[PDB]
Every structure is written in C-alpha cells, then in structure tokens.
Nucleic acid binder design. Structure first.
Lengths: 122, 122
RNA sequence: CAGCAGCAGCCCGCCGCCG
RNA sequence: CAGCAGCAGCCCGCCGCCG
C-alpha cells in the first residue's frame, strides 16, 4: 500500500508516553494524530508537534494534495468512493469528508483545518 | 428546546428545489446545511447563501459562542457529553467534535471551518 | 429539499478489560 | 501511546423506496 503520508509515524511507546504524562496535561501532548481514509482503507500518523513555527512547518509537510491524490487514485474507479481526512489535537477532532470527485477541494479544506487546529490559542 | 441558532431554518420546499435544479449544478446550491449536536439532541439549519460578502456576513451570524453555550448548557452535568458541529457545502462536509469541556475551542474551530468552507474557490 | 430502508466506513462521548 | 469489548450519537460513500 502506498501511503498519502511523506513522513513516518512517530507514535510514542507506552513507556515514553507515561514518562511524558509524569513530567507535564491534555493541552501539552507529545503531538497530534491525523488520518486519511479512501473507501475502507485508512492510513494514520501520530506526529510530534511542539507549537513552534519550525515544528508547524515540518508537520504541515506530512502530506500534500499530490501525495494524497497518488495514494487515493489506487482505489478509484467509475463509482465515487468516500474520502475522509481527520485530525485530533488537544481534545478537538476535525473531519473533512466527501466523495472522490471532490478530492482536491477536500485537500484544500483539510490543510486549512490542520493549520487552524495546530495554531489554536492556549 | 432552546436552539443554538439565531436565524430560522430556510429549507426549500420540494418544488422550490426542483425549480432551482431546472434553472442552474452541485457547485451552485440554494444554500448549505449545518448542525449542532449535544449528546443525543441535534439542531439543524439549511441557510440560503449566494457567495456575496453580504450573504456570508448574514449566515456567519446564525450562531455564536454565546448562543451555542446557552443551548448546550441545558444538557450539561458532571460527566462530559459529546458536542459536534457539522457543515456541508458543495459536496464537502466538515465536522468539529469533542467533549463539552472543550466547547469554547470547538466553537472557535467551527466558525473558522464554516468561513473557510463558504469561501472555498470555484 | 424532506422521509424510510439496506450495505459499508469514519469520527465523537461514556464505560470496561488489556500491552 | 497501542489493542479488544460494551452503550450511545454524528458524518461520509454506495444503493433502493418514497413526499
């Protein structure tokens, strides 16, 4: 399976996550989760994010309209399939979803949702 | 039930909707649908929207952080409940959801999602 | 636009068990 | 952070019937 993502997953081990809980707080997690679904197949990432501009720029590079289109187009055919982007950060989940015909518009709304959620104030 | 919405619903009748289909196209609907859910209770609106600045300003007034908090607080208690905003326009659905503890953050992301979707280019 | 139904998926809240 | 399970809701895609 070719993934829509350009960065590898960064899920913390159970021990790393416990170490982080012990030393921080829902509003200061190690990072965020995001996922892309195309019909029944779902790709997920956990990515480290520390709220600096450097870190925001890095994690905004985790998928592009091109990389999502390349991965999704594996699953395309005559009938439309459902496509969905989800992102969860600090207790708030955003999902952008529609049919594969509207995929470009879904990626534009998904990237804007991602940037707005990751920059949401204190 | 006190609604989170400050404008009445504007669902078209079946006949009005058919008249509009006949004379337009998924990218030029009469308006958009939006909904607020608080535990099991859901409030919905269809609102007319024609993509002008006047119209965008009007429909952005359909709920505020205050009006959503007043409606949601009817359903609050000790345990958190799930809160969800959804908006669908031109084939793309955005859902912002989380627990009632994060409701203010959900409203901030919901209003930004709404403005960004309603202004999405051709 | 509305309503009912089938198939499939995702997301949220509560809650248990578990690495 | 991961996995399995229960209860409830929402959203998406396909599809039928219907005002």
């Amino acid at each position: 399976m070719t993934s829509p993502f350009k960065l590898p997953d960064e899920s913390p081990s159970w021990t790393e996550w416990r170490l982080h809980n012990d030393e921080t707080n829902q509003d200061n997690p190690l990072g965020f989760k995001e996922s892309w679904g195309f019909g029944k197949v779902v790709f997920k990432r956990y990515l480290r994010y520390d709220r600096t501009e450097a870190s925001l720029h890095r994690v905004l590079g985790s998928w592009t309209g091109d990389s999502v289109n390349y991965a999704a187009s594996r699953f395309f055919g005559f009938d439309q399939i459902g496509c969905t982007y989800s992102i969860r950060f600090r207790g708030v989940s955003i999902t952008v979803s529609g049919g594969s015909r509207t995929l470009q518009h879904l990626c534009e709304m998904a990237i804007r949702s991602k940037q707005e959620l990751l920059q949401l104030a204190p």
